[PDB]
Amino acid sequence: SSLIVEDAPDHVRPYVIRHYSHARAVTVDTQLYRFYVTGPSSGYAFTLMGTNAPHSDALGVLPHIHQKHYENFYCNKGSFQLWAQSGNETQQTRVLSSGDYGSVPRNVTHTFQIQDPDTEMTGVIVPGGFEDLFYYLGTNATDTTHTPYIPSSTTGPDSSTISTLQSFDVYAELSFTPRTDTVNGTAPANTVWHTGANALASTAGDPYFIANGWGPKYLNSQYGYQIVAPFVTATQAQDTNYTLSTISMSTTPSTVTVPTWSFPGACAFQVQEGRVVVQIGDYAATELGSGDVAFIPGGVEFKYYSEAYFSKVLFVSSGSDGLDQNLVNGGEEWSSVSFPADW
Amino acid sequence: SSLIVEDAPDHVRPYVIRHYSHARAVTVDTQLYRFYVTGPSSGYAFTLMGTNAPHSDALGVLPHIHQKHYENFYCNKGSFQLWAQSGNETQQTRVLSSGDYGSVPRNVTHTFQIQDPDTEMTGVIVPGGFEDLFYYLGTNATDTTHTPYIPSSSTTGPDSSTISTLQSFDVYAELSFTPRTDTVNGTAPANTVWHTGANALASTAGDPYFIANGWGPKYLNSQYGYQIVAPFVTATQAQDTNYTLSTISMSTTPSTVTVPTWSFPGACAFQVQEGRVVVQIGDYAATELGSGDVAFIPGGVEFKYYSEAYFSKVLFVSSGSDGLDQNLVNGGEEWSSVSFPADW
Ligand SMILES: *[C@@H]1O[C@H](CO)[C@@H](O[C@@H]2O[C@H](CO)[C@@H](O)[C@H](O)[C@H]2NC(C)=O)[C@H](O)[C@H]1NC(C)=O
Ligand SMILES: *[C@@H]1O[C@H](CO)[C@@H](O[C@@H]2O[C@H](CO)[C@@H](O)[C@H](O)[C@H]2NC(C)=O)[C@H](O)[C@H]1NC(C)=O
Ligand SMILES: O=c1c(O)c(-c2ccc(O)c(O)c2)oc2cc(O)cc(O)c12
Ligand SMILES: O=c1c(O)c(-c2ccc(O)c(O)c2)oc2cc(O)cc(O)c12
Ligand SMILES: *[C@@H]1O[C@H](CO)[C@@H](O)[C@H](O)[C@H]1NC(C)=O
Ligand SMILES: *[C@@H]1O[C@H](CO)[C@@H](O)[C@H](O)[C@H]1NC(C)=O
Ligand SMILES: *[C@@H]1O[C@H](CO)[C@@H](O)[C@H](O)[C@H]1NC(C)=O
Ligand SMILES: *[C@@H]1O[C@H](CO)[C@@H](O)[C@H](O)[C@H]1NC(C)=O
Ligand SMILES: *[C@@H]1O[C@H](CO)[C@@H](O)[C@H](O)[C@H]1NC(C)=O
Ligand SMILES: *[C@@H]1O[C@H](CO)[C@@H](O)[C@H](O)[C@H]1NC(C)=O
Ligand SMILES: *[C@@H]1O[C@H](CO)[C@@H](O)[C@H](O)[C@H]1NC(C)=O
Ligand SMILES: [Cu+2]
Ligand SMILES: [Cu+2]
Numbered sequence: 001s002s003l004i005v006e007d008a009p010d011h012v013r014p015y016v017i018r019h020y021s022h023a024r025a026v027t028v029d030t031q032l033y034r035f036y037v038t039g040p041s042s043g044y045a046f047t048l049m050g051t052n053a054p055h056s057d058a059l060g061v062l063p064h065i066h067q068k069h070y071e072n073f074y075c076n077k078g079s080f081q082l083w084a085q086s087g088n089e090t091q092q093t094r095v096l097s098s099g100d101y102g103s104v105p106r107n108v109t110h111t112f113q114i115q116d117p118d119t120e121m122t123g124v125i126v127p128g129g130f131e132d133l134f135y136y137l138g139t140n141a142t143d144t145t146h147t148p149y150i151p152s153s154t155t156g157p158d159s160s161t162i163s164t165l166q167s168f169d170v171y172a173e174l175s176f177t178p179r180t181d182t183v184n185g186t187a188p189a190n191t192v193w194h195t196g197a198n199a200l201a202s203t204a205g206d207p208y209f210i211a212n213g214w215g216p217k218y219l220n221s222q223y224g225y226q227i228v229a230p231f232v233t234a235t236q237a238q239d240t241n242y243t244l245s246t247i248s249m250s251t252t253p254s255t256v257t258v259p260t261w262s263f264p265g266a267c268a269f270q271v272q273e274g275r276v277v278v279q280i281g282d283y284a285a286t287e288l289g290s291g292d293v294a295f296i297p298g299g300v301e302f303k304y305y306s307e308a309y310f311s312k313v314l315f316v317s318s319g320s321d322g323l324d325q326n327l328v329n330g331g332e333e334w335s336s337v338s339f340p341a342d343w
Numbered sequence: 344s345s346l347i348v349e350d351a352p353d354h355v356r357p358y359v360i361r362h363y364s365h366a367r368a369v370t371v372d373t374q375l376y377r378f379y380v381t382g383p384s385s386g387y388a389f390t391l392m393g394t395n396a397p398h399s400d401a402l403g404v405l406p407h408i409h410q411k412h413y414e415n416f417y418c419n420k421g422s423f424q425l426w427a428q429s430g431n432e433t434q435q436t437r438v439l440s441s442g443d444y445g446s447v448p449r450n451v452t453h454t455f456q457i458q459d460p461d462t463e464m465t466g467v468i469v470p471g472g473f474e475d476l477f478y479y480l481g482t483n484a485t486d487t488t489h490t491p492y493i494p495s496s497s498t499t500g501p502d503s504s505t506i507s508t509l510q511s512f513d514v515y516a517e518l519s520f521t522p523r524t525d526t527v528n529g530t531a532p533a534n535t536v537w538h539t540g541a542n543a544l545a546s547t548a549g550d551p552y553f554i555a556n557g558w559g560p561k562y563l564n565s566q567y568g569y570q571i572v573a574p575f576v577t578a579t580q581a582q583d584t585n586y587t588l589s590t591i592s593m594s595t596t597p598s599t600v601t602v603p604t605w606s607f608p609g610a611c612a613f614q615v616q617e618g619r620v621v622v623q624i625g626d627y628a629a630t631e632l633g634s635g636d637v638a639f640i641p642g643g644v645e646f647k648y649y650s651e652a653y654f655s656k657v658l659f660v661s662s663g664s665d666g667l668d669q670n671l672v673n674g675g676e677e678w679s680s681v682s683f684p685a686d687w
Contacts, residue, residue: 018652018653019618019652019653019654020652020653020654021653052682054680054681054682077441077442077556077617078556078557079440079538097422097440097441098420098440098441098442099420099441099461115538116538116555116556116557116558117556117557117558117680117681118442118556118557118681118682141685142685143685144685144686144687145569145594145595145683145684145685145686145687146594146595146653146654147569147594147654147682147683147684147685148654148681148682149682150682150685151679151680151682151683151684151685183527183528184527184528184529185528194422194458194459211459212420212421212459212460212461213421213459213460213461214459214460225488225490250488250489250490251488251489273420273634273635274362274633274634275633275634289618289619289633289634289652290617290618290619290633290634290652291617291618291652308361308362308363308633308634308635309361309362309363309364309489310362310363310489310490310491335494336397336460336494336495337397337460337461337491338395338397338461338490338491338492338493338494339488339490339494340488340490340494341484341485341486341487341488341490341493341494342487342488343487343488
């Protein structure tokens with residue numbers, strides 16, 4: 001029919017959805033949510049959503065936990081503060097700016113606050129279907145012009161109502177007090193934020209944060225150069241059974257055949273920088289730019305390559321051995337965000 | 344010949360140059376410079392260059408002044424700190440992250456330091472031709488794969504002896520400048536506004552100033568779909584350097600609105616920051632630009648542009664006082680959001 005769709009399909013199929021497409025949009029006060037990948041569109045594998053919002057002096061949501069969902073916060077642009085705490089571990093907070101990442105495993109108390117005027121948060125939540133919460137809390141938005149968001153109490157449900165959302169896997173943590181001793185975008189002191197390497201948490205269940213470019217990286221040289229920066233591996237996902245990362249890409253040299261991939265689990269990516277061509281199943285090849293999302297059903301063959309000299313995508317895969325993990329296993333440890341200057 | 348080029352042309356003509364094209368690449372230590380618009384390519388109107396670099400614990404250049412060039416620093420991605428001081432005024436510094444902007448007029452002392460691993464600075468320097476300095480001090484880079492910078496603590500670039508010798512290049516050393524070290528939350532001195540509130544352009548020419556992404560003044564133009572101009576340099580600050588600089592954010596063009604043709608006295612250019620923008624210049628094919636791609640339009644050449652993405656943002660520069668950004672401002676209204684209205 002058409003590979004490109006304006007809202008996520010109501011069933012599993014190859015699709016691309018452009019940045020700021022309608023995507024069943026709702027607003028929650030000033031925040032505008034778009035559901036690029038849903039439970040029905042992914043066969044319940046994962047939800048990929050974008051939230052665009054203006055600066056707020058108040059929290060963007062009351063503190064809460066998910067018992068059954070793993071949540072991932074990625075800052076596409078602008079900035080937002082994220083607070084997280086597992087059990088009786090020290091409360092952590094970071095101010096995420098463009099390309100920064102925050103990991104929120106099951107049973108981790110969290111909240112966020114939108115700082116900059118042009119802020120966009122990409123949420124990847126596993127398993128899929130978590131969006132039903134926003135269908136309830138939000139008000140449908142026609143947003144005819146596709147504007148990123150519509151131009152101080154805490155945003156969202158009040159204390160009574162947030163304590164009423166257990167059926168959507170939201171559990172209130174009303175006694176949680178977000179720490180107020182942030183300095184240079186982090187607290188407590190003696191955390192590393194934009195000043196040094198960030199490791200993935202070695203302990204399952206603990207939150208962690210990776211500043212843009214400061215996490216572990218792997219160079220794969222098999223099909224041109226690709227650099228995988230892991231955000232979630234089997235160590236962290238455990239039974240939620242997924243991977244999450246960015247993949248950075250060179251062009252494919254004309255002497256290299258662009259490979260054909262197929263994996264048992266669904267996967268998806270959102271372009272962050274550059275221009276990436278995707279050919280999925282029997283559909284025409286389509287070039288994606290900033291914020292565009294490609295979705296590939298499990299078991300469907302696909303090909304992708306970068307038309308830009310350098311592109312970076314945020315990538316999610318259902319399963320323990322999707323594309324990013326395959327590229328890591330076929331690659332080597334690498335200490336740069338740039339690939340070699342020679343083939 | 345063809346619209347799309349791998350290095351900027353050697354004479355004035357319409358062209359498009361893709362992000363990370365060769366663009367007469369040079370390195371200076373760890374920094375890789377690319378010259379998307381040059382003096383010769385713009386008829387000396389302006390230079391638009393991109394510098395990609397990894398984190399450094401040292402300054403990216405020794406402190407210095409330009410007497411005849413106005414420098415503009417825009418953070419495409421990553422982050423870098425910028426220091427600046429004019430005459431008798433207090434020394435200012437900000438840590439710029441994606442979409443942030445720092446203005447450095449003639450006769451303002453300045454230096455910078457690269458903070459994050461994947462940092463990209465776009466420099467717009469007026470008038471054009473300043474890039475000779477980077478040819479001269481730089482080392483030619485072939486960069487076959489077009490990698491953003493070459494993978495790999497003294498101050499980067501010329502030593503103090505060398506930088507005191509570069510007057511011909513309009514570089515004057517300020518070796519007694521001490522970059523302030525009391526940065527907190529990305530700014531010093533403490534009594535400044537950075538990512539916490541509105542930023543104004545300088546009240547007059549000659550003074551440095553900084554605009555954090557989304558926090559400067561904005562104007563909505565509704566004549567051709569919705570466009571939001573966020574000025575960075577106006578006639579007030581440019582004076583005789585005679586240019587304007589801003590971002591322009593764009594909606595799609597509604598089917599009932601004709602995409603306008605423009606033809607300006609002076610050369611103009613833009614680099615896409617977010618989104619997908621089609622440009623149709625002269626008799627060349629409509630061409631779609633993505634992140635970091637640059638379009639250059641000579642004065643006197645007709646062109647049309649529109650956004651294929653639902654929202655695009657470009658960094659825009661024009662020679663003259665009445666280029667595209669100022670035209671859209673004059674035809675528009677003050678506006679307090681980085682988003683345009685939800686209805687046409
Ligand atoms: C640096 O920025 C942080 C915000 O990230 C400031 O922390 C705030 O401090 C005030 C006053 O103590 C508190 O009431 C707020 O709740 C704090 N915010 C957060 C999120 O921690 C801090 O004041 C700034 N430091 C300086 C010197 O400007
Ligand atoms: C917050 O970040 C700033 C840098 O932006 C740190 O500033 C440095 O502080 C050290 C020790 O005082 C100085 O030696 C450096 O010269 C400073 N750098 C700059 C660029 O000003 C600051 O220490 C950080 N604050 C905290 C409490 O961690
Ligand atoms: O439970 C909630 C939640 O998780 C998130 C969220 C938002 C953006 C993301 O990118 C993300 O990963 C999660 O927002 C909310 C907003 C509300 O008003 C109420 C909620 O209960 C949540
Ligand atoms: O004079 C100089 C200068 O201005 C800049 C510069 C760099 C990036 C920008 O984006 C910009 O606007 C200016 O770098 C330099 C680097 C050197 O090694 C020596 C110099 O003399 C300069
Ligand atoms: C999360 O906490 C709940 C309630 O205490 C517990 O039943 C559950 O096993 C925990 N889940 C995980 C994945 O740790
Ligand atoms: C909001 O949109 C959904 C999805 O189309 C629809 O089911 C629902 O009825 C809408 N709500 C209202 C109140 O119209
Ligand atoms: C993980 O997901 C993959 C792909 O969806 C699937 O093949 C596999 O059965 C899953 N494994 C587990 C342990 O559930
Ligand atoms: C810059 O300083 C030089 C040397 O003092 C002076 O001659 C020149 O006129 C100044 N230019 C401007 C625009 O202020
Ligand atoms: C700055 O201060 C000095 C004296 O310290 C003075 O000579 C100079 O004229 C002042 N600058 C201006 C522009 O007034
Ligand atoms: C050009 O660059 C190379 C390294 O890329 C350097 O060795 C060489 O001297 C430079 N100049 C010439 C004349 O090739
Ligand atoms: C300013 O630039 C415009 C466009 O290039 C040019 O036509 C005009 O002559 C310039 N004005 C002055 C006084 O330099
Ligand atoms: Cu949550
Ligand atoms: Cu300079």
